[PDB]
Amino acid sequence: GTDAPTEAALKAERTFMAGEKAKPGVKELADGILMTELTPGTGPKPDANGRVEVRYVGRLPDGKIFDQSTQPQWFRLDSVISGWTSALQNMPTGAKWRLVIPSDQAYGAEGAGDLIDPFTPLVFEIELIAVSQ
């Protein structure tokens, strides 16, 4: 119910992100997003202004699920957090990816009220079911 000093919160985010970056098989995509491939795919990749149909689980660094799909769900890439916009352009239909997204590519300093604190990196597991224009 109260915010950690930026100094401490930023340090915690940086050490979390650096730890994830060092893990085996992790690829650093644009803008600091870290990807681990659970399952490869060989289908189409989405355009920056296209749509993705996904299953997903979104977690805080301590594991807490803050949002998840209940069925495959369509999103516009130009209308989601910027970490999805950039990272998912790399993702072929059929793949299952783990993404670790720095807070400046997610909800940043503002967070999401009391649901996501300022300076919180996010961990997603995403299955790409389909893409479209």
Automatic annotation (TrEMBL):
Source organism superkingdom: Bacteria
Catalytic reaction list: [protein]-peptidylproline (omega=180) = [protein]-peptidylproline (omega=0)
Tagged with keyword Signal: yes
EC number: 5.2.1.8
GO biological process terms, semicolon-separated: protein folding
GO molecular function: peptidyl-prolyl cis-trans isomerase activity
Keyword entries, A-Z: Isomerase, Rotamase, Signal
PPIase FKBP-type domain segment(s): 49-132
Similarity field: Belongs to the FKBP-type PPIase family.
Protein name: Peptidyl-prolyl cis-trans isomerase
